[PDB]
């Protein structure tokens, strides 16, 4: 930092000095002087360097070992009180040399005058309300005071208020008045309220504190600006934006939503394609991000939860304002030099070319504290001196000197050139941090950092509320047909319903999905929910595709039965009894009513239960069934996921490939294979699945890992020639595969292209990706975990609970165990072979149009089909009594297993010791 | 205008540019109406306007078939399966057919089969681009040469080319998984064969060069040690002479890959490395025989003992 303003010199008695470059004295303002961390032995070296500079008046060059005597350079530091969090105490050996001055807040009453001067300044644009300069200021000050007392650090660690918030509010009020239309008192009050919302209540967490701030705003307005014509001051009730008009005026909600939709469609088309649904919170946050990006040093920190839309929302808002989006393409083996080069390129584009970039820094786009320090230096100043120093400085000053000449402005001094450079960076570079969970150590360090927290506008997206989920679901379940279930409006409590009052099956579906998501997060997740619905969206998409597929299947079966009935009605003595056995047209009416319920259960099972135990799956399935029963949607009472989704052929293929006989493993494999809209993440301690998948894909399987050096290239081959990829490690993850984890491709005429690192590679279309992990203890990045279909292949303790049953019933009721398996086995093979015989009969009738000798085979097969009809009826009648007895018999051996699992837990604890 | 539009219809497809074609079609549309009614009543103006409207009706098709992925094989398939005719091979292989043929193919209707064949065209070009990149890289690769005290030439930076050869071999292996590999098999197989031979020569060469450097410090410099081991140094001098001739003839080629065509190169390097390993074993046995006579030499090592 000193290299720009200091000039090393040499003298015989004056071995190298480091004085001013100019003739003016130099004052080193070291802000946050007590912030740097201290070594493990308890000594922070930067403070000792400062003491050396103030006591010894010099230091030692580390390459050359020469005493450098600083000349007429002064040291002025600034520090928060040591009692503040993160403030390391400073040694008395350093502060012994410095005069300490305490600067408190300006008394709380002087703030009134200090900002009344600002309001008198900014009301020169609107003289008609000159007399309102004094009220506003007091109100503003009062607001600040209240927000300082209500929202303390005890609630949230980022609830730090200061007069800087008041200055931001005054600048916002001016920059809305300056570019706004002719104003009225109601308009000014609403404008001030909007700016107050954006300054004080953006960082607030939870609807309780937002409502508290809203009532505080109402009280302040009624106390200091007792106007009589005002609307609702809620966050979504007032919307100020210059996207529609050329001014900055409060816009109607409907026009804003229509414009946002018609622009978002174009953005999804011409830019990267991600099918997305527009809702009210999206519009509000688009306005917030637009306001932040519009100002000069507009940096934002979006603290939400994964899969909320923050990154793509920032990209959309940048595209609206014509900002070049730059995202650091870093990976696991990316060091500080790569980040420095990326920042250098971004700065060069920002200044030497006036590119107006928008650097989106994710939480995972920083790996060590050096990246965060680079962000601090870039944000606190408007430049990073460490990038441009030494000879690289000499080039920069050259590139400035040419460039500043091309703009028609003359600047020959180095200081003037660098000041123009800093100003261009400040007014052209916007940094938008996006962090998923703020309780993580990296994200907590990002938030608590002084430069970021003081320069960035903390916008707390948070997780989706029930209104946003209802809007998204309504816009997502409006594509699939539901004109066959014959829904009847059910009687439910007003608290249970989330969308508009239930009048159709679609509202019931969205209510069930929202309620199950809430219950699932209530059971699995504890305390606060830093997880935004990615399960909800994936479940909605799965339900859409599954309803479509199941209705197509039902249509095909109905068509087959109807054409068979028509053929039989066209048809010599026993076919009248196949008129009876074609009563399945009556069964179709019952099985079509339960189609939506079965599809909901199967989609929820595919999405949520991938990473659950054998008992958690049962409990949450019971919860989902009681939720379906709470509303008026029906489902197959004896529903089995394996029977419903996977067919016999696929199950036999999986068993042949090497999969176990467990129902848990069959369900896990069904989840892995059936759901291929998202990458599957197979977790298993034994690697027995890695071979199984390979056995499924023969010679096409390619095994990689995130540890080997050539992996980055090898995938680029497998991704270009269509070979199934299994990555042996998943706990590690280099974000270069990021554009592959989320299906975010660059389409063209007929070639689909994906960006990996900085290479664009063509996707064959035969390429699958399975991520595989071994240790369940290992963690996966929040970006990966919420995008990927996590499937647990572990053999938990609860696997004992069922397994001993299959032993007990084997040696306690041998005949009952024998009938249990063959009941379902014969049932399934009957549902296949009766259809087989029906199409046999149909094609035989096709071949028996007018012959007589051929009818003997027709008659004998007609008599045959009666046998399987009797067996089907007998099996159904026997099951009607077997299932009650089976469920009665389950509970006894469940009692046995309750002790068995405890015993095994104790044994495993012993083994752990 | 009729002469101009007839001339623009006869330009070879290998030279047609859509950017100027758009302006030319705009001019044709502008100048169609200004023709007098004598042209309008005749078939000349009607045919001209119909052909101009045919050209302007499809413009995505023209730019898609202007892509580099298209090849004479694809043009032959398009002509045979859509145009129902055969194109002269000289007219086809150079893509010099006129725009009238493109009109004949009737891009408006057969666009579904057109896109079906173009998709195959881009995938085959995905394979061909990797093949061309590998060939271009290995037609310009060369070692980095230095000269030490002796007249021998030494290679530096083995990795920058060894890793490239290994990665290219892995790429050529992985190309077999692609469905559209059959047409490119006859070239990929030969390229893989050449790269395997080059990789074997590289593996022998790095070891030969390393062992020769290691032994040059021991033998060939100190006269005393060569006197204690006359057979070893006598063999070493002949090895150095043969290696010098081999390396001079090898770097007289300006390309790394062409060493696979040098007569008796890989076997020569195998013999050289075998003889160097035998000389190293002889040194080890001599040093151990010296240490077993005065065992305190076990506290010194090899360089000190030498
Ligand atoms: N309104 C919405 N409609 C549909 N899907 C959405 C919506 N908002 C977010 N999503 C889903 O959440 C993801 C958000 O993407 P992105 O913003 O890039 O990641 P992050 O939210 O973690 O920053 C998208 O993949 C999208 O599928």
Q: What is the DSSP string of A552-600?
A: HHHHHHHHHHHHHHHHHHH---SHHHHHHHTTHHHHHHHHHHTHHHHHH
**Tokens encoding A464:** 């989706």
Q: Give the separation between CA A762 and CA A754, rounded to whole angstroms.
A: 6
How was this structure determined? It was done by cryo-EM
Q: Give the separation between CA A609 and CA A790, rounded to whole angstroms.
A: 9
| Residue A277 CA, ligand 1 centroid: distance in Å | 9
- Picking from A719, A751, A754 by the largest number of B CB atoms within 10 A of its own CB, the best residue to mutate is A751
At A324 the three-state DSSP class reads strand
Rounded to 5°, the CA angle A592-A595-A596 comes to 130
Residue A889 makes CB contacts below 8 A (sequence gap 6+) with A809, A813, A816
- Is the CB of residue A739 below 6 angstroms from any atom belonging to ligand 1? no
What number of H helices and E strands is found in chain A?
Answer: 33, 19
Q: Are B202 and B261 in contact (CB under 8 A)?
A: no
Contact B127 A721 (CB under 8 A): yes
Q: Give the separation between CA B297 and CA A501, rounded to whole angstroms.
A: 97
Residue A163: exposure state from Cβ atoms within 10 A (0-12, 13-18, ≥19): middle
**Tokens encoding A456:** 């960035």
Alpha helices in A733-854 (DSSP H): 738-741, 782-787, 798-812, 814-847
Q: How many CA atoms lie within 13 A of A467 on its CB side?
A: 6
* Cα end-to-end distance, chain A, whole Å: 55
Contact B174 A717 (CB under 8 A): yes
DSSP B98: B
| Residue pointed to by tokens 């479509």 | A548
Q: Are A293 and A763 in contact (CB under 8 A)?
A: no
- Tell me the angle at which helices A391-406 and A414-428 cross, rounded to the nearest 10 degrees: 80
Each as own residue / partner, the long-range contacts of residues B281-286 (CB below 8 Å, 24 or more positions apart, any chain) are: B282/B229, B282/B231, B282/B232, B283/B215, B283/B218, B283/B219, B283/B229, B283/B232, B286/B228, B286/B229
- A726 — phi, psi (to 5°)? -120, 120
* Cα end-to-end distance, chain B, whole Å: 94
Q: How many CB atoms lie within 10 A of CB A770?
A: 21
Residue B81 makes CB contacts below 8 A (sequence gap 6+) with B113
Contact A710 B178 (CB under 8 A): no
The answer to whether the Cα torsion of A18, A19, A21, A27 is positive or negative is positive
Q: How far is CA B251 from CA B140, B153, B214, in A?
A: 13, 9, 22
Nearest to A511 by CA among A521, A523, A499, A493: A499
Phi-psi region at A307: left, alpha or beta (left = phi > 0; alpha = psi -120 to 50): left
Q: How many CA atoms lie within 13 A of A118 on its CB side?
A: 21
Q: Give the separation between CA A796 and CA A908, rounded to whole angstroms.
A: 12
Residue A576 makes CB contacts below 8 A (sequence gap 6+) with none
Q: Which residues of B touch A (CB under 8 A)?
A: 60, 64, 67, 115, 118-119, 122-123, 126-127, 130, 167, 170-171, 174-175, 177-179, 181
The answer to whether the annotation marks A311 as part of a ligand binding site is: yes
- Of ligand 1's listed atoms, the one at least distance from the Cα of A787 is 25
CA distance B98 to chain A (A): 24
Per 3-state DSSP, chain B is made up of helix, strand and coil in percentages (nearest 5) of 70, 5, 25
- Chain B residues in contact with A718 by the CB 8 A cut-off are 174, 177
Nearest residue on chain A to B63, judged by CA atoms?
A749
Q: Give the separation between CA A405 and CA A349, rounded to whole angstroms.
A: 17
Q: Are B86 and B79 in contact (CB under 8 A)?
A: yes
Q: Are A58 and A52 in contact (CB under 8 A)?
A: yes
**Tokens encoding A779:** 């963690």
Q: Are B5 and B48 in contact (CB under 8 A)?
A: yes
Residue A681: exposure state from Cβ atoms within 10 A (0-12, 13-18, ≥19): buried
Return the H-helix or E-strand segment holding A148: helix A133-150
Return the H-helix or E-strand segment holding B246: helix B230-251
**Tokens encoding B158:** 């083995």
**Tokens encoding A107:** 């008394």
**Tokens encoding A640:** 């089995």
Strands across the sheet containing A17-19: A17-19, A67-71, A58-60
- Is the CB of residue A537 below 6 angstroms from any atom belonging to ligand 1? yes
Contact A750 B118 (CB under 8 A): yes
Q: Give the separation between CA A59 and CA A131, rounded to whole angstroms.
A: 59
- Chain A residues in contact with B172 by the CB 8 A cut-off are none
Q: Give the separation between CA A155 and CA A258, rounded to whole angstroms.
A: 38
Q: B63 - beta bridge partners?
A: none
Return the H-helix or E-strand segment holding A726: strand A725-727
DSSP A279: -
**Tokens encoding B200:** 């074997």
Alpha helices in A660-813 (DSSP H): 663-674, 688-697, 711-721, 738-741, 782-787, 798-812
At A772 the three-state DSSP class reads strand
**Tokens encoding B111:** 């666009």
Q: Give the separation between CA A868 and CA A831, rounded to whole angstroms.
A: 10
**Tokens encoding A330:** 């870093």
DSSP A482: -
Q: Which residues of A touch B (CB under 8 A)?
A: 699-700, 702, 710, 713-714, 717-718, 720-723, 749-751, 762, 764, 766
Q: Give the separation between CA B105 and CA A646, rounded to whole angstroms.
A: 47
DSSP B44: H
Q: Give the separation between CA A484 and CA A554, rounded to whole angstroms.
A: 11
At A493 the three-state DSSP class reads coil
At B147 the three-state DSSP class reads strand
Q: Give the separation between CA A895 and CA A808, rounded to whole angstroms.
A: 12
Q: Give the separation between CA B282 and CA B220, rounded to whole angstroms.
A: 15
CB-CB: which of B122, B170, B178 is closest to A722?
A: B178
At A93 the three-state DSSP class reads helix
Buried residues in A459-487 as b, exposed as e (16+ CB within 10 A): bbbbbbeeebbbbbbbebbeebebeebeb
Q: Give the separation between CA A357 and CA A350, rounded to whole angstroms.
A: 6
């Amino acid at each position: 930092a000193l290299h720009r303003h200091t000039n090393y010199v040499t003298t015989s008695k004056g071995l190298t000095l480091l004085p001013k470059s100019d003739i003016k004295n130099l004052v080193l303002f070291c802000d946050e002087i007590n912030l740097p961390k201290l070594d493990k032995y308890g000594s922070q070296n930067v403070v000792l360097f400062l003491r050396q500079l103030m006591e010894k008046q010099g230091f030692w060059k580390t390459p050359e070992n020469k005493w450098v005597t600083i000349e007429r350079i002064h040291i002025v530091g600034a520090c928060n009180p040591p009692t503040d969090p993160g403030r390391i105490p400073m040694s008395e050996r350093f502060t012994r040399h410095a005069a300490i001055l305490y600067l408190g807040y300006p008394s709380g009453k002087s703030l009134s005058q200090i900002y009344e001067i600002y309001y008198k300044a900014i009301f020169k644009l609107v003289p008609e309300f000159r007399s309102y300069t004094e009220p506003f200021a007091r109100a503003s000050v009062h607001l600040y005071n209240e927000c300082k007392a209500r929202y303390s650090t005890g609630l949230q660690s980022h609830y730090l208020f200061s007069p800087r918030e008041l200055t931001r509010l005054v600048r916002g009020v001016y920059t809305a008045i300056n570019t706004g239309p002719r104003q009225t008192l109601r308009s000014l009050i609403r404008l001030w309220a909007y700016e107050a919302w954006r300054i004080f209540a953006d960082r607030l967490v939870g609807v309780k504190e937002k409502n508290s701030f809203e009532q505080l705003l109402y009280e302040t307005v009624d106390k200091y600006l007792p106007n009589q014509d005002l609307g609702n001051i809620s966050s979504t009730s007032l919307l100020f934006s210059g996207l529609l008009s050329l001014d900055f005026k409060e816009v109607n909600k409907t026009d804003l939503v229509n414009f946002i939709e018609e622009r978002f469609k174009t953005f999804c088309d011409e830019e990267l394609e991600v099918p997305m649904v527009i809702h009210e919170s999206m519009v509000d946050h688009i306005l917030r991000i637009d306001r932040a990006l519009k100002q000069v040093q507009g940096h934002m920190m979006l603290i939400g939860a994964s899969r909320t839309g923050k990154t793509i929302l920032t990209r959309f808002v940048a595209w609206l304002n014509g900002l070049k989006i730059v995202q650091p393409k870093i990976h696991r083996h990316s060091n500080l030099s790569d980040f420095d080069m990326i920042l250098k390129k971004a700065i060069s584009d920002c200044s030497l070319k006036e590119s107006r970039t928008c650097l989106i820094i994710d939480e995972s786009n920083i790996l060590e504290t050096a990246f965060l320090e680079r962000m601090n230096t870039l944000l606190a100043n408007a430049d990073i001196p460490d990038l441009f120093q030494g000879e690289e400085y000499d080039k920069l000053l050259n590139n400035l000197r040419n460039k500043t000449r091309s703009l028609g402005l003359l600047l020959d001094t180095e200081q003037e050139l660098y000041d123009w450079f800093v100003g261009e960076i400040a007014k052209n570079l916007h940094v938008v941090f996006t962090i998923c969970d703020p309780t993580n150590n990296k994200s907590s360090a990002m938030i608590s950092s002084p430069a970021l927290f003081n320069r960035c506008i903390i916008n707390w997206m948070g997780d989706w509320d029930t209104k946003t989920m209802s809007q998204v679901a309504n816009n997502m379940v409006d594509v699939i047909p539901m004109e066959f279930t014959d829904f009847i409006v059910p009687e439910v409590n007003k608290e249970l319903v989330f969308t508009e009052p239930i009048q159709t099956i679609r509202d019931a579906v969205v209510n069930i999905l929202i309620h199950f998501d809430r219950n699932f997060y209530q059971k699995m997740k504890v305390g606060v929910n830093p997880r935004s619905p990615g399960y909800f969206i994936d479940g909605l998409r799965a339900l859409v595709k599954l309803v479509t597929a199941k209705y197509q299947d039902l249509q095909e079966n109905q068509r087959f039965v109807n054409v068979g009935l028509e053929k039989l009605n066209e048809s010599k003595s026993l076919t009248f009894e196949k008129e009876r056995w074609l009563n399945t047209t009556k069964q179709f009416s019952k099985t079509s009513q339960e189609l939506i319920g079965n599809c909901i259960i199967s989609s929820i099972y595919e999405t949520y239960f991938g990473h659950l135990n054998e008992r958690e799956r049962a409990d949450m399935l019971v919860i989902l069934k009681r939720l379906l029963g709470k509303f008026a949607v029906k489902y197959d009472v004896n529903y089995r996921f394996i029977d419903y989704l996977v067919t016999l052929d696929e199950k036999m293929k999986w068993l042949e490939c090497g999969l176990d006989k467990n129902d848990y493993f069959l369900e896990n494999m069904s989840i892995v294979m059936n759901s291929q809209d998202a990458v599957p993440f197979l977790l298993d301690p034994s690697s027995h699945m890695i071979t199984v998948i390979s056995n499924y894909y023969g010679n096409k399987t390619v095994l990689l890992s995130f540890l080997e050096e050539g992996f980055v290239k090898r995938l680029e081959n497998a991704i270009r020639f269509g070979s199934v990829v299994i990555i042996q490690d998943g706990e590690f993850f280099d974000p270069i595969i990021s554009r592959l984890i989320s299906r975010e491709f660059n389409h063209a005429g007929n070639r689909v292209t994906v960006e990996i690192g900085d290479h664009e590679v063509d996707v064959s279309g035969d390429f699958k990706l399975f991520i595989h992990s071994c240790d369940p203890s290992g963690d996966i990045p929040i970006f990966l975990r919420s995008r990927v279909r996590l499937v647990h292949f572990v053999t938990n303790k609860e696997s004992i609970e069922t397994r001993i049953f299959d032993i007990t019933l084997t040696e306690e009721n041998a005949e009952m165990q024998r009938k249990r398996e063959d009941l379902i086995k014969l049932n399934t093979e009957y549902k296949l072979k009766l259809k087989n015989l029906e199409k046999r009969l149909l094609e035989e009738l096709n071949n028996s149009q007018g012959n007589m000798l051929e009818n003997d085979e027709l008659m004998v097969t007609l008599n045959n089909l009666k046998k399987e009809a009797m067996n089907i009826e007998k099996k159904l009648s026997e099951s009607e009594e077997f299932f009650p007895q089976f469920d009665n018999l389950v509970e006894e051996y469940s009692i046995i297993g309750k002790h068995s699992v405890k015993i095994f837990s104790m044994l495993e604890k012993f083994g752990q010791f | 205008l009729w002469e101009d539009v007839q001339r623009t219809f006869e330009t070879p497809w290998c030279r047609v540019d859509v950017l100027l074609l758009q302006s030319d079609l705009a001019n044709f549309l502008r100048r169609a109406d200004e023709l007098p009614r004598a042209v309008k009543q005749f078939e000349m103006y009607k045919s001209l306007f119909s052909q101009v409207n045919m050209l302007t009706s499809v413009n995505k098709i023209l730019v898609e078939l202007k892509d580099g992925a298209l090849k004479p094989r694809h043009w032959n398939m398009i002509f045979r399966d859509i145009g129902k005719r055969q194109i002269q091979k000289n007219l086809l292989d150079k893509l010099e057919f006129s725009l009238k043929d493109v009109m004949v193919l009737n891009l408006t209707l057969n666009e579904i089969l057109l896109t079906k064949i173009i998709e195959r065209a881009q995938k085959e070009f995905v394979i061909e681009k990797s093949l061309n990149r590998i060939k271009k890289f290995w037609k310009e690769a060369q070692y980095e040469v230095i000269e030490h005290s002796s007249g021998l030439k030494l290679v530096r930076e083995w990795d920058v080319l060894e890793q490239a050869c290994k990665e290219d071999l892995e790429e050529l292996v992985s190309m077999k998984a692609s469905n559209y590999y059959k047409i490119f098999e006859q070239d990929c197989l030969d390229l893989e064969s050449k790269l395997t031979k080059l990789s074997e020569i590289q593996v022998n060469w790095v070891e030969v060069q390393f062992y020769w450097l290691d032994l040059y410090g021991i033998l060939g410099e100190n006269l005393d040690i060569q006197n204690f081991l006359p057979l070893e140094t006598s063999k070493f001098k002949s090895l150095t002479s043969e290696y010098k001739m081999i390396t001079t003839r090898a770097f007289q080629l300006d390309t790394t890959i062409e060493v696979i065509h040098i007569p008796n190169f890989d076997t020569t390097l195998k013999l050289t490395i075998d003889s160097l390993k035998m000389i190293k074993s002889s040194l080890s046995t001599f040093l151990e025989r010296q240490r077993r006579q005065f065992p305190r030499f076990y506290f010194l090592g090899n360089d000190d003992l030498l």
